[PDB]
Amino acid sequence: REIVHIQAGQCGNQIGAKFWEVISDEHGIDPTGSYHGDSDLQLERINVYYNEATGNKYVPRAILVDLEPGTMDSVRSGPFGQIFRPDNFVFGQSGAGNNWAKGHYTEGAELVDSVLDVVRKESESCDCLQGFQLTHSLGGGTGSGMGTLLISKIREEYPDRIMNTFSVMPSPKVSDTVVEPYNATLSVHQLVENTDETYSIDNEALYDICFRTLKLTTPTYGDLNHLVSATMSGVTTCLRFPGQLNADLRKLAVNMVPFPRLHFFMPGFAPLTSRGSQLTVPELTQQMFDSKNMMAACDPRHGRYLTVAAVFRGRMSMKEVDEQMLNVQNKNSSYFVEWIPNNVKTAVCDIPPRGLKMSATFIGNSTAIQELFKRISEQFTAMFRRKAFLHWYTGEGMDEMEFTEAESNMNDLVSEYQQYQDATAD
Amino acid sequence: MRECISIHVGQAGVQIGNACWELYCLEHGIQPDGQMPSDKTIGGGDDSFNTFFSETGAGKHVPRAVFVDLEPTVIDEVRTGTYRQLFHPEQLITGKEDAANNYARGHYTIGKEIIDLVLDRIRKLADQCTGLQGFLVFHSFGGGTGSGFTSLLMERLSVDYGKKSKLEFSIYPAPQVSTAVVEPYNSILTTHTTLEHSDCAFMVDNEAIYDICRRNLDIERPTYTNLNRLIGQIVSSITASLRFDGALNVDLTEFQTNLVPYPRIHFPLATYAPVISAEKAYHEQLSVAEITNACFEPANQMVKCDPRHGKYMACCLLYRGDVVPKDVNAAIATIKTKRTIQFVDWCPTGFKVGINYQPPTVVPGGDLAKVQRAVCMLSNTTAIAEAWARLDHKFDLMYAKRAFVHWYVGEGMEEGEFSEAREDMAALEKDYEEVGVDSV
Amino acid sequence: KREHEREVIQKAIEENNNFIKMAKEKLAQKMESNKENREAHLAAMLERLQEKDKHAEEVRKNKELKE
Ligand SMILES: CC[C@H](C)[C@H](NC(=O)[C@@]1(C)CCCN1C)C(=O)N(C)[C@H](C[C@@H](OC(C)=O)c1nc(C(=O)N[C@@H](Cc2ccc(N)cc2)C[C@H](C)C(=O)O)cs1)C(C)C
Ligand SMILES: Nc1nc2c(ncn2[C@@H]2O[C@H](COP(=O)(O)OP(=O)(O)OP(=O)(O)O)[C@@H](O)[C@H]2O)c(=O)[nH]1
Ligand SMILES: Nc1nc2c(ncn2[C@@H]2O[C@H](COP(=O)(O)OP(=O)(O)O)[C@@H](O)[C@H]2O)c(=O)[nH]1
Ligand SMILES: [Ca+2]
Ligand SMILES: [Mg+2]
Ligand SMILES: [Mg+2]
Ligand SMILES: [Mg+2]
CATH class of the missing domain: 3.30.1330.20 (Tubulin/FtsZ, C-terminal domain)
Structure with missing residues (x-):
């Protein structure tokens, strides 16, 4: 029933903050923490993400973590910063300075137990905890290293719970930071082994959608976060509203993860929107299978779909949805693994997101995600062959061995996404 | 005499039970509070409806039923619904965490924790029977509770009741209403484990029911409500032989005698x-x-x-x-x-x-x-073996690449249980081929 | 004849008993193989995690070794 939310670093807290605004809006919860909605369905499963506080109040079961107070202070100052539990803001003063080793082994390590205490306080008061969801970046130091350190520390105390992450992937089109490929490769090496399900949020994809598709002159971080929020609202719909398909973290994991390591999903969304002021069932159905609507800079047609989840939001014909979903599957049969029958699952939610009458979120486990990992391994090998910037990491305590190991594991993961992309039915 | 206990396992099993019990009440003149004005024998009688309904001193006709699911949300609707006064709270059994479309969780992990509680309540109902005939088990093939918990319960009922009749109404998986990609694994696992422990099994292809609702009843996108209303009718027809009396009435056992030539060939x-x-x-x-x-x-x-x-x-x-x-x-x-x-x-x-x-x-x-x-x-x-083959083909496609098997292995199961289940299914398909050959 | 009649009812009873027995045995065997397996799986998982903790000490010690 209950999920525990954890936002780490700058990126994590920023995307995590928007998640809470958007879903609160949807569930009829104001920044004070009261319900002022119309439909009963908004409350049915509110206990999933919110705590029913004394005096008919609703508190996000969220833990805000950062090695620097900067971002968290801005979140507290924010529109919804008052809905939160004040005790759930756990912050350092030092910072990670976009260093994985700092968030993982040293600075983040000294702060990790103070976090665990809040994680436990939240987990003890759960009637039947499902698992946890972490929002973070892989390019930084805090969300990257401490976020991955938190993942393994939590798994030691709740080994039988679902570990879900929204991992924002580093792009050169988005940041000047040179150590971003080093921080990502060490993070992905952690995620392969310790997460059950990871939503791959590629900044390259979010930027190109903003610049090219959305026609944004100078895309900002908040512009990128409007895509992240839309994606995050869609992928959690089935968990928050009464439904039949993928209604809990494990049912979703059993349906999406055929092989333990291959748990990196390509999110997709239609209609693509900008926070400015501005689609049929076949149009929605068509768009969420085209590269332009992919939250990861990967082409579905350059790989095969192992499994897919399709969420439909708004009042439409279920018959039409069924017919359109059948149409795309028959018309694109080659791009779906034959050895996994009936791999596309479809859910229908009558509650549309705000500002839309109908939307479609796509959750895909495509072998085409190897394009996102190949790009990061190229960005890593450019530096690693040179042994460039390694003092930042060896100095904090690490070895050159750890980077060789992390590179291999991410190279092995790509060999595996290819292995099943080439796998035959007969 | 000749009482039958009904066991409704998982969402499919529970929702079908709701429809079935709702319909039996309507057929016997039983009010949503359990009262039956038509019955003059207060506190009890020997009437034909008494095979399915027990009687309280007060005049409440109580279903001889247990509803089990590893999660509260589906049974909670029964507790609150129109027929909340029909059942005693002890007949409605919920866990907190479901089997997450995993046979291994319903059979082992989660299921092991609730099994003895379920057996106690079945025993309580059994103890009120003057001459128990047997059980009717309603479950799906695809769900983790529907597949694994039913298996475990069947095995336990054979141990606890001997060769006392165990009949099933099993929901066969269909893409149009399918909840999980691993339904073919759960179906083959439950079929193998339950084969020895069932005397007769009535399979209900959700696709077949879907098509009837669409074609015969002209319903665009049939709901579980529509489906269960049609299943309610088929179930009622098969149990009418037991719930009513008449000169031309032939008992379900007499039909079974003719329907089962060999113990494994028990799917009508x-x-x-x-x-x-x-x-x-x-x-x-x-x-x-x-x-x-x-x-x-x-x-x-x-x-x-x-x-x-x-x-x-x-x-x-x-x-x-x-x-x-x-x-x-x-x-x-x-x-x-x-x-x-x-x-x-x-x-x-x-x-x-x-x-x-x-x-x-x-x-x-x-x-x-x-x-x-x-x-x-x-x-x-x-x-009927065509159904076995379609399900067996889907299983084969996935198990060749060991797709999703870790979810089962991580819950305590071995690859050996998968291969052994599948070999039983090949044997059953061969048995159905053999019976069809003309004698020499 | 009275002997064979006695033998037949005895065979019915023994086959029913052997059935309940074998069923009891198969279940006990399966619930123990599953208990041992799931436990062994959690054990393996936590040693892998405990070794990640052991390695982190080796890193924090290697840092303090320079000072
Ligand atoms: C010349 C350096 C600039 C700053 C940088 N340039 C680059 O990324 C390029 C590609 C240029 C060439 C080399 N390379 C480094 C850049 O444009 N970015 C880093 C932006 C992000 C930047 O936007 C602009 C237009 O510069 C920022 N946006 C915000 C922002 O949205 N602020 C919002 C609050 C916020 C603060 C931090 C975080 N992480 C999230 C949110 C508030 C405003 C109102 C809004 O939401 O738009 C801050 S910096 C893009 C790529 C995402
Ligand atoms: N006809 C019919 N099929 C149903 C119903 N509910 C679920 N199913 C089918 O049953 C399968 C899924 O099984 P569920 O009953 O939801 O599973 P469960 O026993 O509750 O198992 P868990 O929830 O995993 O513990 C699919 O084939 C569904 O189409 C129902 O009310 N009627
Ligand atoms: N889309 C998105 N990316 C962000 C945001 N904030 C930072 N990033 C990215 O995060 C990476 C650096 O990690 P950051 O979260 O800032 O560092 P941390 O505080 O150490 O976790 C870079 O690739 C940034 O482009 C944000 O709000 N949205
Ligand atoms: Ca009576
Ligand atoms: Mg930063
Ligand atoms: Mg940066
Ligand atoms: Mg269920």
Whole structure:
């Protein structure tokens, strides 16, 4: 029933903050923490993400973590910063300075137990905890290293719970930071082994959608976060509203993860929107299978779909949805693994997101995600062959061995996404 | 005497139970509070409805039923719903965490924690029976509770009750209403484990029911509500033999004697007629001959398969309502001379017939038209093995690449349980082929 | 004849008993193989995690070794 939310670093807290605004809006919860909605369905499963506080109040079961107070202070100052539990803001003063080793082994390590205490306080008061969801970046130091350190520390105390992450992937089109490929490769090496399900949020994809598709002159971080929020609202719909398909973290994991390591999903969304002021069932159905609507800079047609989840939001014909979903599957049969029958699952939610009458979120486990990992391994090998910037990491305590190991594991993961992309039915 | 305990396992099993019990009440004149004005024997009697309903001193007719699910949300709706006063709180059993579409969780992990509580409550119901006949188990093939918990419960019921009758109504998976990609694994795992522990199993292809609702009842995108209303009718037809009395009434056991030639060949095909809309039934009444012929129409089957490409090993006709022997006899004679039914060379070509005079009742706010007479045919055809093959092909595609197997292995299961289950399914498919060969 | 009649009812009883027995045995065997397996799986998982903790000490010690 209950999920525990954890936002780490700058990126994590920023995307995590928007998640809470958007879903609160949807569930009829104001920044004070009261319900002022119309439909009963908004409350049915509110206990999933919110705590029913004394005096008919609703508190996000969220833990805000950062090695620097900067971002968290801005979140507290924010529109919804008052809905939160004040005790759930756990912050350092030092910072990670976009260093994985700092968030993982040293600075983040000294702060990790103070976090665990809040994680436990939240987990003890759960009637039947499902698992946890972490929002973070892989390019930084805090969300990257401490976020991955938190993942393994939590798994030691709740080994039988679902570990879900929204991992924002580093792009050169988005940041000047040179150590971003080093921080990502060490993070992905952690995620392969310790997460059950990871939503791959590629900044390259979010930027190109903003610049090219959305026609944004100078895309900002908040512009990128409007895509992240839309994606995050869609992928959690089935968990928050009464439904039949993928209604809990494990049912979703059993349906999406055929092989333990291959748990990196390509999110997709239609209609693509900008926070400015501005689609049929076949149009929605068509768009969420085209590269332009992919939250990861990967082409579905350059790989095969192992499994897919399709969420439909708004009042439409279920018959039409069924017919359109059948149409795309028959018309694109080659791009779906034959050895996994009936791999596309479809859910229908009558509650549309705000500002839309109908939307479609796509959750895909495509072998085409190897394009996102190949790009990061190229960005890593450019530096690693040179042994460039390694003092930042060896100095904090690490070895050159750890980077060789992390590179291999991410190279092995790509060999595996290819292995099943080439796998035959007969 | 001759009481039957019904066990409703998982969402499919529970929601079908809701529909079934709702319908039995309507057929016997039992109010949503359990009161039956028609019954003069207060506190108890020997009436035919007493095989399914117990009686309190107060005058409440209580279903001889246990509802089990590893999660509260589905059973909670029964606790709050129209018939909340029909059941005692102790008959409605919930866990906190479900089996997450995993056989291993329902059979082992989660299921092991609730099994003894379920057995206690079955025992409590058993203890109120003067002469327990057996059990009716409602579950899905695809869900983790529906597959794993039913398996475990069946095994435990064989240990606890011996060879006391264990019948099942199993929901067969269909893509149109399918909840999980691993349904073919759960179906093969439950079929293997339960094979030895069931005396008769009525499979209900969700696709077959879906098609009937769409085609016969003209429903765009049928809901579980629509599906369960049609299943309610088929189940009622098969249990009517037990819940009513009459001169022409043949007991479910007598049908079973004819339906089961070999212990493993215990899957009968159910065909129901008529399934018609109020609009399509206005000024058109269907005769005994009309409804009988409709039974040999593949469009009216509970499982999608071709019995015209298979061989019969039995035919049972279960009539409901305004039906007299003269007409049934004539309708059978016609089908026979019409020579449309090929039988195995080793068995008699007779049709076993039962008739209950009480006509089919309909749930208010239904799609189904109230008809004067209805029929349910139970046949043992080699064609039912087509269902086994389709499910077995899907399993094969996935298990070749060991797709999703870690989810089972991580819950304590071995690859060996998968291969052993599949080999039993190959053996069963071979058994169905063997029975169809003419003797030398 | 009275002997064979006695023998037949005895065979019915023994086959029913042997059935309940074998069922009891198969279940006990499966619930123990599953208990041992799931436990062994959690054990393996936590040693892998405990070794990640052991390695982190080796890193924090290697850092303090320079000072
Ligand atoms: C010349 C350096 C600039 C700053 C940088 N340039 C680059 O990325 C390029 C590609 C240029 C060439 C080399 N390379 C480094 C850049 O444009 N970005 C880093 C932006 C992000 C930047 O936007 C602009 C237009 O510069 C920022 N946006 C915000 C922002 O949205 N602020 C919002 C609050 C916020 C603060 C931090 C975080 N992480 C999230 C949110 C508030 C405003 C109102 C809004 O939401 O738009 C801050 S910096 C893009 C790529 C995402
Ligand atoms: N006809 C019918 N099928 C149903 C119903 N509910 C679920 N199913 C089918 O059953 C399968 C899924 O099984 P569920 O009943 O939801 O599973 P469960 O036993 O509750 O198992 P868990 O929830 O995993 O513990 C799919 O094939 C569904 O189409 C119902 O009310 N009627
Ligand atoms: N889309 C998105 N990316 C962000 C945001 N904030 C930072 N990033 C990215 O995060 C990476 C650096 O990690 P950051 O979260 O800032 O560092 P941390 O505080 O150490 O976790 C870079 O690739 C940034 O482009 C944000 O709000 N949205
Ligand atoms: Ca009575
Ligand atoms: Mg930063
Ligand atoms: Mg940066
Ligand atoms: Mg369920």
